[model samples]
Target: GVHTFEEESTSPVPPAKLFKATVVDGDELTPKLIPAIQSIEIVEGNGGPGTVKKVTAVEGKTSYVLHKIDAIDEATYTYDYTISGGTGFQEILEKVSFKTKLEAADGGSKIKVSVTFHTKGDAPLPDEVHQDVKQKSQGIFKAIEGYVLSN
Candidate 1:
């Protein structure tokens, strides 16, 4: 079953500004904001689609956290990516794909994050995966909003 959901969060900053910080310069800026993340190294490709970044975490459990970009649209301020070769949720599922759209809402911005869990064959999706996505998405968005507005 393709169980997917859309989550929306509002930010005080405008769409362009938020997108620049999170999407454009995220590879460099994220580690500074999140302490657990030590750094993000570009393994291959440029900055567009097919780019893979190795995520090094200070308190990480997985062997490696890597993600590949599917598309990045500056005009629409949207991005699509998939979990490439991380050991996360690989046993019970194939992969988790995400598409984020940063839309202008009034003078602020709206983050519409879509989450999808692709199971392996007839494997069942677990509640833990859902819970993990819920927690991480909310937490990271808030952190990014705060980071963008602040230092």
Candidate 2:
């Protein structure tokens, strides 16, 4: 088993507005900003709890099935996902959760992103995985910031 984690914090964005934006247009909005993201398509279920979507992830000259979202929340701005099947890494990524939490900072809303990824298989944890995750996180946050500012 392998355990990998990464965290990122955005300076600040109003909690309610952030929640609305994420819940309403996460699939469309995220791919536009995050370079690693190729596309996100809702596959089954309504666009709510229990809804599943196929995520296409891109890394340089390759792309693969990154994962599928398993859960979501509009009020708190949180969601969870799992890698259904993919390449680049030989691990069964389970319960990969991404969350957005807001706190009062400098009289504004501060966003904290927490990611937890659990892997299944006998591969040893690679140290560089953090760097990869961080880069992705940075891209994601940068996209989020850009979107928020533009709106």
Candidate 3:
């Protein structure tokens, strides 16, 4: 089974600035601003496309999650990544992917985030699990946006 999750939000910052802050500086700035994110380590390759990152949560709650950078288009303010292995993923999930886009809005930046989940079998994930992931992502976004605004 495959599940898709989509969300949209607006930030007070512009698209170009938001892209530089979030997409370009994501690995370096995320853990510093988001309390839930303890740290990020590049386990394989450079920190660019084709690199693999290990995301560790705070207080040993989730441990480490593996994420591979699929694509990054700075000009378009779009990024794609796949989560293949990690403690954060349930055994029933084969893989997870995320695509994000930032566009210029009237007074801010419009952001779209999409998530796709692939199941290991026919079993479907619980609603709460999906919601949990969504909330965490939003939390990260909020943290990053707040950081950009304040700094």
Candidate 4:
């Protein structure tokens, strides 16, 4: 049972709108924020809850998958994701939850990123087998924070 936590804050122009740009509304940021994200295509369901999207990217290697969104909320600013079926992450990430929060600040929204995961202790995560999850997950959050502020 490994537990980890990380936090960061940044100011962005039109935090609400900028936040959306960094999110999954469209294939807007696939090519910008993440260069490895080659393409993101909607597969079955609408771009809403229960919607499926086929993602193609070059994150260390060319990867593909259909991610069935577990939850999507606009007002509260939160969403859940599960690797419905995929090549890269589904096999590795057992579970992942990404949430964006807006707080009343002097400038803009105060974004907070929190994550929870289930993995074998000796399976190379917290120990030594797979530090990618811990390292890459944190990098993902930092990327968003950097993108928001720069934009």
Candidate 5:
């Protein structure tokens, strides 16, 4: 079965400020500030939609994943991306896809996110597995959020 979900996060900073940390300068900032990620390298294209990036992460063992930007629009506060091909996948997953859009509200911003897991088999991913993914996702942004808001 195909697995996917949507989530939204409210931030104290406005869209522009938050988006800059999470999207606009993500390639540069994440590895610098986040602990899980070791580095993000551009394999092809610029930071625009259709760009391909390779991420190196350390989890006891170094794991690498390739990420592609499907869409990114600063003016509209929307971004889309796909992740695949890594030691982390272990040939078990086809890919992980993401979509995000931010909206201005309440003196801050609402960050809406969608994630879909494309599995290579109908083997039923474990509940804890998805929860771990969700937790990591939220933690990354919050770390970036805290880092950005402070400076």
Candidate 6:
């Protein structure tokens, strides 16, 4: 079974600036902003389509996330990626996909995030796990927002 979730956040940063931070400078800045992420190393591709990366957390837990960059429209400030095959979720999930769109709004930027999680079997995931993952995901965005605000 597959479950989907959506979240949106607005930032004072401009769309282009925020997009650059989120897409272009993410690999370099993520660990600095979000302390939970210890490192992001690309194992394949040049930070583009068909890239495979390993994400290691501060807790020493790691996930080998295979990614396919579906689309990146700089003109419209949109990006999409599908991720799977990670040690963190190999047994419980089939994949985790994400789509993000950033647009100019009220002198700032509005970011819309859509996430879908495909489970391994027919069983649905526990509510606590779902909420925990959602919170962690949102934490990343919040950290980025804070980074943009302060810097």
Best by lDDT: 5
Question: How are the candidates ranked when ordered by lDDT, highest leading?
Answer: 5, 3, 1, 6, 2, 4
Per-residue accuracy of model 6 over 30-106 as CA lDDT, tens digit each: 88887667788887788766777777674455554556677777888888887677665556877778899999999
- What CA root-mean-square deviation does each model show from the true structure? 2.0, 3.3, 1.7, 3.8, 1.4, 2.0
lDDT by residue (tens digit), candidate 4, 42-113: 787876787777878786679886667767666666655654357756444554444445554566666665
Q: Tens digits of per-residue lDDT for model 5 on 5-57?
A: 98887998899989988899888888888777999999999788789999998
- Cα deviation in Å at residue 119, candidate 3? 1.6
TM-score-superior candidate, 4 or 5: 5
Clashing pairs in 3: none
Tens digits of per-residue lDDT for model 3, 1-151: 9998888888899999888888789889999988778888899997678999999986446677788999898898998999877776667778889999999999789999899988877777778768776777777778888888998
Candidate 2 regions exceeding 4 Å error are: 2-8, 60-62, 88-95, 103-107, 121-124
3 versus 4: better lDDT goes to:
3
Candidate 6, residue 53: the lDDT equals: 70
Judging by lDDT, tell me the better candidate of 1 and 2.
1
lDDT for each residue of candidate 2 in 40-146, tens digit (9 for 90 to 100): 87777777666667777766555555445556766656655554455644344543555555555664466666666566666655557645655665666557766
Per-model TM-score on C-alpha atoms: 0.87, 0.71, 0.90, 0.67, 0.93, 0.86
- Candidate 6: where are CA atoms >4 Å away? 60-64
What does the lDDT come to for candidate 2? 0.62
- Which clashing pairs does model 4 show? 124-129, 124-130
Query: Where does candidate 1 stray beyond 4 Å?
Result: 60-62, 88-90, 121-123
**All models: lDDT?**
0.79, 0.62, 0.84, 0.59, 0.86, 0.78
**Which residue pairs in candidate 6 have backbone atoms (N, alpha carbon, C) closer than 3 angstroms, thus clashing?**
none
The best-first sequence of candidates by TM-score reads 5, 3, 1, 6, 2, 4
lDDT of 3 at 106: 90
List of clashing residue pairs for candidate 2: none
The candidate maximizing TM-score is: 5
